[PDB]
């Protein structure tokens, strides 16, 4: 069931912005670890005396890394005279965010038809305003409302290159890395209480609950009209023998925030071979692979979708596989991206649901919780 | 002239500690950019609820990257019950340092015979105490005094693996990168006033001025008895046409601090080939190469030390060459290591002064200031 109840016209995920203490070092690590190219910058070299912001791209995926400079560099400026390319930026907010949460996502940005309208209708429908709509060089409009914790949902709309005041990056400094990652599939938040978080976000967006099919959590997924903007939300389940990883997140993050980003690959096998080659030379680590009983159970569940060869390749790379009633999901999880056991990345590929591929084809891996437990015990043999 | 006036027995540089907002991402970038192996860690996985610290090594060079966790993880602890492996660490100090300075060096650590004695004699001779001597697991003694700005000189002494409470890193996670870097040659500070900085540091160490042989700066080098611990210090020269890079440092750093680390390579050509291969894929960038007139002037100054082939190789890699009365210096400078135009790295190799090689053989590149200007104008032809 899809009521198509969006209160304003939503297009696609546009970008994700990390707030950092040093944007250079995070951006360079991510670039090499994920195979993303340096494509735009806004910093001292472009006249920005407020913040350093570096943009990585792979396909349609856009990762933005931003850190504050000394406030003294811009102490003479006022908002009407600011050199910041992102007018919502605030030194105090950024430093407070990073000292409270460590490295993580500040903004989940979606492109909309009209960012000013999205902002007003959102706020009219319960959204807590974060930064009012501002028109940049008469070309791009940017507005922000609170999403959860200190994460904002950022509306971006274009009259008609990333943002004004960003410069394309020199081709010498811009090496065309590509491991097959192509777009953001979903972005997932952890909160202490799922009900009120859902009521709030669905309340100001009109996003609807995405239909799906006892370990750790409860969740629900909010979706836009064409279900291409997908925002799952988790809450912890307390009292378990094994302490909820959602609760560990909340403790180490100092409250709610973004838990994982799921990046669609056009060839998850190429992506994982490439990322795994680089894990111990500056890239990203992956969670421990499932036991071979898990892959010794894959024939009976997806034997009609993947060959024996493609299954063995899943076993080599530690890939997980789930299926719903319309499609199949290949997925794998990184270890946390920084010091704290908080944010991590998921790589996914979806097969099925062809009409273009419909959003969320195969679900989000709900079945792999039960399957992982079962195969763990079967390998215990 | 070397009075050998050290007020306590100094051995060698031991390590350099960067204070970070996220230590994981800086450490992984540095590891790949410099070819340094992950060798020890102290973090949540080792029981440290206070700070995350990761150690990179290449030869005898030791780079330590440390960031604070949420204070809430250790709110129940007191100093007698701390889980920090570095007892001088303070959340408030670390966050204040990084927000004021951005990414940079907090500690220049030297190994001494007796860290408690070095501390007392230092403080008795004008050193401002930063952290008193503390004995770790009855095996290692650690003490800190102020050096300049918010940088400390850290004394480390061993009765008899890095520090207690650090764990050796798994060989899976520890890839044996090596681009030829072998030890720290010198560590250089920028201050507003050279005279008082020298009087202070030479005052509490007994370090002597290292003898050498109008662009930007004045400097002097402090040295230990065998001149293997080398601490140059710069001050800006004001009123120039070209604004002093020392003054730019002080403005963007919010005052005094460490300007560059000079890393000796056993094969600067291999090191620079390897680092330059990686500049645009997550490593380090290098300052703009000198004009070919500079290399077209190298025959007349070092033609007795480097072949024509070894000179052309200098031209390919952008290496600079200087000479004093006892030896020859090959050197090159990276662009800044992080967002701000503050700290950078120098790669060097020294040839001559064999007895072992004596410290500072060839100097620090004083002559390359005049030579660079001259060759710039000659290429202007
Ligand atoms: C993150 C995720 C998803 C996922 O994407 C996701 C959505 O998009 C929206 C719905 C809620 C949700 O969850 C699906 C399955 C997952 C994981 C995962 O993170 N984990 C890893 C793991 C969790 C705890 C403890 C662990 C201990 C060791 C190793 C892994 C651990 C899984 O096992 N499954 C099976
Ligand atoms: C950092 C250094 C040293 C050096 O090691 C050092 C010591 O150890 C102790 C003594 C003081 C000192 O200085 C020696 C020579 C150097 C540089 C250097 O940094 N630079 C780079 C540069 C400086 C300004 C403006 C620049 C603009 C563009 C490119 C480079 C620029 C040089 O040119 N020389 C020639
Ligand atoms: Co997911
Ligand atoms: Co130097």
Curated annotation (Swiss-Prot), chains A, B:
Keywords: Cytoplasm, Dioxygenase, Iron, Metal-binding, Oxidoreductase, Phenylalanine catabolism, Repeat, Tyrosine catabolism. This is 4-hydroxyphenylpyruvate dioxygenase. It holds the Pfam family Glyoxalase. It catalyses: 3-(4-hydroxyphenyl)pyruvate + O2 = homogentisate + CO2. Residues 12-158, 183-335 form the VOC domain. GO terms for molecular function: 4-hydroxyphenylpyruvate dioxygenase activity; identical protein binding; iron ion binding. Pathway: Amino-acid degradation; L-phenylalanine degradation; acetoacetate and fumarate from L-phenylalanine: step 3/6; Cofactor biosynthesis; prenylquinone biosynthesis. Its cofactor is Fe cation. Gene3D superfamilies: 2,3-Dihydroxybiphenyl 1,2-Dioxygenase, domain 1. InterPro entries: 4OHPhenylPyrv_dOase, 4OHPhenylPyrv_dOase_C, 4OHPhenylPyrv_dOase_N, Glyas_Bleomycin-R_OHBP_Dase, Glyas_Fos-R_dOase_dom, VOC. Catalyzes the conversion of 4-hydroxyphenylpyruvic acid to homogentisic acid, one of the steps in tyrosine catabolism. Its EC number is 1.13.11.27. Binds 1 Fe cation per subunit. One of its GO terms (cellular component) is cytoplasm. Fe cation binds at residues 186, 260, 346. Belongs to the 4HPPD family. It is an enzyme of class 1 (oxidoreductase). GO terms for biological process: L-phenylalanine catabolic process; tyrosine catabolic process. CDD domains: HPPD_C_like, HPPD_N_like. Homodimer.
